[PDB]
Ligand binder design. Structure first.
Ligand SMILES: CC(=O)N[C@@H]1[C@@H](O)[C@@H](O)[C@@H](CO)O[C@H]1O
Ligand SMILES: CC(=O)N[C@@H]1[C@@H](O)[C@@H](O)[C@@H](CO)O[C@H]1O
Lengths: 625, 625
């Protein structure tokens, strides 16, 4: 590859990206031009490449590599619909992306066309004088954040931290020392009005001000009981919509002190000013709150977040609700990686297509693609690359015609192969448009003796689905190069699910039929083999985790999986005592299984959504007193 | 032994009790008399024994066996201070007392002098038409409760179910079906004013009405956020003291429909009407509430519960507070068995002495001794027998001069030997008068690599304390007869704690000193042996659990211990990886350990209180989303 017109910075960036893409032997003249986000023209090995914004050079090169495998003549012109496209990684659900993996992620985002990289850190960044904040969580040092940001800057990608300045601070506020307890209202919510809370928040911005970036998402989502705990005890009943504004104004003043411009999640305005306390509502704004908001709206960008709607109209409705408060809006979409071990790129594609229509219809300047890790971070950080390419394609081209070819240029895999990563969730009888259906997770963590999700299993279809999935994924692993770990992990999981999906039911059928030879088989052969496979899964999972994340947080998985293993040993031992005639009855097996949840009771399929480890694993108490 | 004056019922009861006590070959003439709770006179093999209330015969027999070992001549007269002395077993914290153990407990309570046996059941009794209420919890059927009660009736011991009609329903309200969710306010609290809530409660009393007893404790403690969840969203802001009264009225109306008389925990009146939301307060009663409350207080007995005070004076202050609301009061004291694996009979003794003074000074007629099982029910049900004998002696004699001798008649062990059961809690530098200090539990469940309670350990003291305790307990085990299991369990726990108390610290010390030999030894000898020892403990614990309780709830302990075991394996593997030179640092060990809590920071000792498994075991998230 011969380039003319590059700076040293750009030539060095390109050197890094040769680790992902193969530049052919051609001559490319490069310039900045406002004419297009990306333009590439020329033929017979001599090409002219222009970008509007510096970071767009890297997507241009991915396009160039792609189209030259196909043809000698190139006519590319792209007009991105969004001023900014960002990817936000969850670093608060136990999985803290390690620095080396943050660098890989940045490289890929740059090839895809993202302008912005973001980390969501509730308590997982260090604040001077707050030793419990992020303690044993692998909180990023200021230096690590600076290194990560500086790396992104190598590709003209900007960095935006997503923090919390109200709720979602559960891992911090649990620490039973006065310096932390005095900051609390209730649950995971900080105490509005308490000066020590504003000292903490000032501390958050002092840390962040060590970065170059002056753009921040301050959070403030899901503070459902705000003003109703220690706040209510100290101050009595207040208008909670005004309370939100008072808090918001204090935080904005602190941001201003450090020169930051803020975004925030939008949901609490709607929840606190709607009759049934929900996000998706047209709001009745009390006049005093309307006056307060009118002055605050000019100082903050509201982020409408929605990972769920299957149609443009549903989004547009919410955009119209938001316009009643502000026209300075951004949108946050979803790269589904928060439903256990296995992502849902398929569902992500479905909703992105529709969200992109709505966002364009409402002149949304910025889309933030979110990669949440709900309830323990058990899905791989790189599991959702197809979703990321999907949104990039939608911004730059408004279609997916180039999705797989650009994807294979950037990763070595076709997007279709990569999206087989979803397989543990893709039961055949599901419609593609319902969210959160996560058998990958609940089949895995379910008990043996007390299988409380058993009514949601359909062994005739599920067993061969999982078995075939494991074979499909082993084949993809062998051609996945450096992405192999992802597929190996999923293959082993599907192998486990193919038998575990009904082992609990088979134990009960054998018990009821008095088939003792079968119980003996299950206790002495199948369940010990099940433990061996789970330990193999745990090893693969640990390799995956340690490759992507800091070690901190893996401990919760160690605990969860060690518990599962011990519960399988209980199944073995209880069966043995019964077979030895030292029990008349196995009481666990005498209990009739009820539906776990009725959330999809009306549908013809049996699967469901169950995404809390502690209620998957047992009907007993385990965290409560 | 030969008796005259016995009914058939009494003759049958004494036959059963010969299983516990050794009646000497003497002649006893028995009659009821008003002259004393119990009197015994006579000599030379011929005795006259009177009792006031039928159940007191059985304590009288315990006393007779005791004194006849001392002497031929007998002069006994007792006047009990309390009309009723009850023991309440927690059957809601995962450990549901099996029917066989309920019968043993009743037999022992009879010999001690208790008039009343109680079971605390949040969701752990069956309600027709409510299939999720007690699901997979080992909830008692009506027939099991009837059997337990009829068995108590054999000894003229009455039965009082303790239930919940407001909060503490967490194991039920988690179930994600509409028929459960529609009953919810917030957290573990039912939705006041919802008719389906009142249908549920009617169901509760429908079940209980199948019993003979017409006395019930309806709960209503600790509903901290009542009115502030779904209640607030549906109904707006209301006077919460009035809300409580409205709910209470409804519940009492349901009780009246079935002929019940109610007791209730008193705390929410004080908490809702005090300015800081605390129990130990003389409260200003709002005017509208006083009207409502004065009516309600004539329909229910308030139970002042307090397990913590080391002085009469503090109890007296709270009695005075209560007396400004009602003179229809009972008192609840504590047999401390809710702080992990190991009871605190010693601390129970200390507070009982002072509480007994206060109850006597305030004319209290009924004392309920409570045996809570907080956060998984991991302490043995029979671990607190000394605390039970203590309260019986305080009622009947107003002193403990007879405590050890009556205890040994009743159990075969001196009370001093039995109370060694407490040892895993009895660190030598603790004063006797501070509650909740439970190294038994937190030393056990603490992580290895990330030992977040390490600052609370005092190895030079604690190590020989635990090792010596294990020997002491092994000796007592050998003379404990049918109670041996209790001491066997505790012996193995103390053996584990003597090394585990500082294994995390020694790993850190060897790591910093670069003592790779000690790291090897710890990885390859100590930690595998530790896992072996914990598996033995798990085996002993399981035998104890299955002897005393239903199998339901053991699963949570399997999970917890399974997870601990797996975390010890992680410590082994991380060290190995490091020893192999495939890591430059073990990041877990580079984190400086802070105090876990400042609760007892001002004291001379290092130990503390930490009684939530999920926060002992990890600093990561584990139940939150
Ligand atoms: C702003 C926002 O997205 N908040 C939460 C987020 O933390 C994560 O849990 C996500 C996926 O389930 O759901 C949202 O309710
Ligand atoms: C009425 C009552 O005693 N309520 C609770 C009880 O459930 C138990 O948890 C106990 C020991 O901690 O503490 C209490 O505050």
């Amino acid at each position: 590859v011969r380039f003319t017109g590059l700076s040293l910075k750009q030539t060095q960036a390109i050197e890094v990206l040769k680790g992902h893409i193969s530049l052919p032997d051609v001559e490319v003249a490069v310039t900045q031009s406002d004419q297009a986000s990306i333009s590439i023209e020329g033929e017979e090995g001599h090409y002219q490449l222009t970008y509007r914004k510096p970071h767009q050079l890297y997507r241009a090169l991915s396009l160039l590599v792609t189209v030259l495998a196909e043809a000698d003549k190139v006519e590319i012109e792209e007009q991105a619909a969004y001023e900014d496209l960002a990817y936000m990684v969850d670093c608060s659900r136990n999985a803290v992306l390690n620095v080396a993996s943050a660098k890989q992620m940045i490289e890929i985002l740059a090839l895809m066309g993202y302008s912005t990289f973001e980390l969501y850190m509730e308590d997982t960044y260090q604040i001077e004088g707050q030793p419990y904040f992020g303690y044993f969580r692998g909180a990023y040092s200021a230096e690590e954040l600076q290194e990560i940001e500086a790396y992104a800057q190598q590709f003209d990608v900007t960095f935006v931290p997503c923090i919390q300045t109200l709720a979602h601070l559960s891992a911090f506020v649990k620490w039973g020392v006065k310096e932390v307890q005095e900051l609390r209202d209730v649950e995971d919510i900080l105490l509005i009005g308490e000066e020590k809370v504003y000292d903490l928040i000032d501390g958050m911005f002092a840390t962040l001000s060590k970065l170059k970036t002056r753009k921040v998402n301050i959070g403030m989502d899901q503070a459902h009981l705000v003003g109703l705990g220690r706040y209510l005890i100290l101050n009595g009943v207040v208008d909670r919509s005004l309370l939100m504004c008072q808090h918001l104004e204090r935080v904005l003043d602190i941001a201003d002190k450090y020169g930051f411009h803020c975004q925030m999640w939008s949901d609490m305005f709607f929840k606190l000013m709607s009759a049934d306390g929900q996000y998706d509502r047209d709001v009745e704004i009390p006049e005093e709150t309307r006056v307060y908001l009118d002055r605050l709206k000019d100082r903050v960008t509201l982020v409408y977040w929605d990972y769920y709607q299957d149609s443009e109209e549903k989004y547009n409705r919410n955009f119209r609700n938001h316009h009643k408060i502000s026209h300075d809006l951004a949108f946050a979409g979803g790269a589904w990686k928060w439903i256990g071990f296995t992502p849902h790129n398929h569902f992500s594609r479905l909703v992105a297509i529709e969200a992109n229509k709505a966002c364009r219809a409402n002149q949304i300047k910025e889309v933030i693609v979110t990669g949440w890790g709900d309830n323990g971070g058990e899905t791989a950080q790189f599991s959702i690359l197809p979703s990321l390419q999907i949104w990039a394609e939608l911004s730059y081209r408004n279609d997916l015609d180039g999705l797989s070819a650009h994807f294979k240029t950037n990763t070595g895999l076709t997007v279709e192969d990569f999206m087989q990563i979803d397989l543990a969730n893709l039961l055949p009888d599901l419609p593609g448009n319902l969210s959160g259906i996560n058998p990958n997770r609940y089949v895995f963590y379910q008990d043996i003796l007390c299988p409380i999700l058993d009514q949601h299993m359909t062994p005739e279809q599920d067993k061969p689905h999982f078995a075939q999935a494991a074979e499909t994924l082993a084949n993809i692993k062998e051609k996945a190069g450096n992405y192999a770990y992802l597929f190996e992990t999923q293959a082993q999981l599907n192998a486990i699910l193919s038998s575990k999906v009904d082992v609990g039911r088979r134990i009960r059928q054998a018990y009821q039929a008095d088939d003792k030879e079968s119980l003996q088989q299950i206790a002495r052969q199948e369940l010990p083999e099940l433990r061996s496979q789970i330990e193999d899964f745990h090893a693969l999972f640990s390799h995956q985790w340690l490759k992507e994340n800091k070690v901190f947080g893996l401990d919760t998985v160690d605990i969860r999986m060690g518990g599962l293993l011990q519960r399988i040993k209980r199944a073995e031992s209880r069966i043995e005592v019964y077979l030895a005639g030292q029990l008349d009855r196995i009481d666990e097996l005498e209990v009739e299984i009820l539906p776990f949840t009725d959330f999809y009771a009306d549908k013809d399929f049996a699967a469901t959504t169950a995404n809390q480890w502690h209620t998957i694993a047992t009907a007993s108490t385990i965290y409560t007193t």
